[PDB]
Amino acid sequence: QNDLVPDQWKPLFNNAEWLVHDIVVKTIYGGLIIAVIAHVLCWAWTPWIR
């Protein structure tokens, strides 16, 4: 069942896997943002390169 996946990615993705993929990429972006903020805070606390 391939009707919502774009015609470019039809051979690779299904209707359900498209949605699960989108969820995964959003989670990855959120985690990256949080990790960047945490590393900035810890560097401001005590720098580990001196």
Binding site: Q1, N14, N15, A16, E17, V20
Partner: peptide, 8 residues
């Protein structure tokens, strides 16, 4: 169809 099962 579904890549993973809800129970797992």
């Amino acid at each position: 169809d579904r890549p993973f099962e809800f129970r797992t």
